[PDB]
């Protein structure tokens with residue numbers, strides 16, 4: 001079944017690694033610098049991994065040491081706007097679960113709709129809105145092997161990990177924001193009317209990923225921490241043209257702070 | 270076509286029954302007690318019915334007498350979160366239509382977002398929000414054999430049936446609420462941010478069913494009455510973990526009142 | 539690929555035509571009268587066009603002269619509620635692009651939710667809400683041959699074309715409204731609760747088309763102008779039953795003004 005696929009994937013991964021990570025990190029598009037801070041023990045290209053989706057817009061699974069602990073890092077992820085199903089988008093999370101990963105740190109780039117946000121701000125995700133997503137990764141003809149049929153979503157981002165983020169940030173003098181993330185499919189950016197409405201719904205930041213992974217991670221009983229880099233501002237009255245290159249550059253600008261935050265958080269787990 | 274399938278299904282059902290019900294009832298998950306009040310003339314397991322979807326999370330069609338009238342009762346229904354298409358979810362409604370059912374009573378369990386609601390409250394559905402549903406049961410390459418191409422939805426829950434509910438409830442001293450139901454796919458429950466936004470949109474109760482059936486029933490010209498059992502409270506500031514067992518228990522608590530209400534309504538039609 | 543299909547389609551069209559239109563017009567359902575004002579040089583039934591979707595609820599591509607300029611007119615379009623994929627819905631726009639069309643004028647019928655709107659009003663679309671659409675025409679496994687991967691949507695309806703509309707309308711004494719259009723799938727009309735919520739989101743008019751085309755046109759770098767005929771009023775407190783025949787009749791009522799507006803706009807380009 002899906003269980004047999006996951007077994008095959010994890011068996012392949014276990015044959016390459018000797019570390020036993022209990023922590024996993026999904027790096028957002030344009031946020032690969034963390035891998036430089038990582039003492040890399042094993043590198044596994046996505047193309048070699050059984051049942052992983054082929055050819056992402058290379059993709060690498062890295063196993064090594066960070067903040068004095070064993071971690072697995074996904075460099076590259078699968079996006080719904082690339083034409084992957086939600087099951088493919090979230091397959092790596094199921095794999096991390098079966099590897100024994102208990103804590104998942106997810107980062108992404110997002111548009112800031114909160115008026116106090118500036119480009120390059122780091123925003124801890126304390127909640128999300130998932131209801132715009134057109135396909136749900138939990139819709140399966142059969143009940144789950146692991147977890148509840150109808151998982152509770154009253155705390156999808158674990159409070160202790162949010163508090164830890166803020167503790168570390170205060171200690172390192174990293175300004176840190178928090179708020180509600182809303183997932184859209186993309187790939188087109190949002191209209192002015194859309195930004196206005198999303199803000200009115202209570203969203204602080206909008207992005208094109210992450211939420212499916214967090215849903216699956218919570219259903220599987222993992223502890224999740226999520227963080228957005230604010231790469232562009234989405235104030236509809238003063239909205240200008242956004243450009244992928246500027247978004248990537250802005251993401252890169254914030255990476256040193258993000259890397260430092262994440263390393264020190266892991267160090268403290 | 271789909272017409273030929275429906276014929277085959279109804280032909281099979283007609284071969285088992287001798288009653289001529291003009292009233293149909295869809296029982297929500299965790300609300301089977303009504304079948305005890307039913308004088309059952311015929312029992313038809315879902316697994317034996319041509320073109321019905323296989324294996325629900327048994328499923329029975331019961332034909333008998335309730336409130337002095339012939340009725341058909343669906344014990345068990347098909348949910349989008351179980352992986353059925355919207356066409357499969359609503360196929361039983363098309364079948365009831367072709368059987369000659371004119372009045373449809375639909376019940377479900379829902380989360381209460383209206384601050385005056387308490388667990389076990391009965392809420393008459395006076396309107397719904399369907400726009401979060403990711404697939405629409407009316408999207409067909411061919412125009413419908415029965416009904417309008419673009420059906421009006423200014424009164425999806427017939428006023429006379431709502432008034433009747435309230436009349437019966439006052440007479441039996443059953444407290445009765447009313448409000449707007451919003452359908453989500455699930456199967457995960459909603460986040461705090463999601464509950465806040467849904468309430469802000471004007472929803473009173475949120476559930477994972479019913480709306481597709483009501484859309485098809487209205488398109489087919491049937492009279493619909495809908496009622497939710499409030500099984501859990503969804504006030505986002507004071508939200509606690511929900512559990513399937515507690516939701517089912519709460520549903521069961523409300524069933525005697527619901528059964529009494531429904532029997533006396535049917536008695537009065 | 540999709541590129542080869544488009545080539546085949548355009549090659550077929552080029553073999554029938556001798557004009558070189560740089561302007562394209564998509565006529566909304568119930569708004570065919572513009573073709574009477576058109577000096578028709580070539581008529582191409584949809585059924586003969588390679589890779590066009592078969593059998594619409596005839597369909598014709600007309601090439602001719604209007605407002606002293608060469609134009610292509612789509613009489614008949616493909617709707618998501620008819621069971622076509624979003625790729626099929628927007629294929630004609632890709633074809634117009636490959637024909638060299640730079641300016642696209644799109645018209646439709648819509649329900650008016652702005653309290654100042656009356657039936658037969660013309661409303662220029664100055665922005666849209668696309669996030670209810672369940673499938674996105676840009677979700678492709680491969681990056682686009684033309685355009686950006688993540689197109690900006692800060693100005694999906696070109697300001698100069700909106701200003702031109704208003705200039706022409708003032709000159710011809712045509713009252714003209716403007717506002718935000720929201721796309722829904724249909725085919726059922728909206729409930730009272732839905733009209734209330736859509737208005738609250740900031741929509742002025744709601745319809746069952748157009749947005750997919752505008753997204754693709756903008757991604758392909760075309761200039762878009764959009765206009766709705768308000769065919770029915772959607773004030774939820776005073777909502778009455780809508781009927782397709784009355785909607786079509788109302789659309790027809792507004793056509794002379796719309797045709798005059800469009801001809802004089804094209805004349806001025």
Ligand SMILES: Nc1ncnc2[nH]cnc12
Nearest residue numbers: 109110111206207208231
């Ligand atoms: N404005 C935006 N909208 C959606 N996703 C984004 N990712 C980064 N910026 C974004």
Ligand SMILES: Nc1ncnc2[nH]cnc12
Nearest residue numbers: 378379380475476477500
């Ligand atoms: N809170 C809730 N959300 C969605 N569906 C439900 N069914 C019962 N309770 C529910």
Ligand SMILES: Nc1ncnc2[nH]cnc12
Nearest residue numbers: 647648649744745746769
């Ligand atoms: N009220 C309405 N809703 C959706 N689409 C429409 N097209 C015309 N009127 C409409």
Ligand SMILES: [Cl-]
Nearest residue numbers: 200201469738
């Ligand atoms: Cl709102």
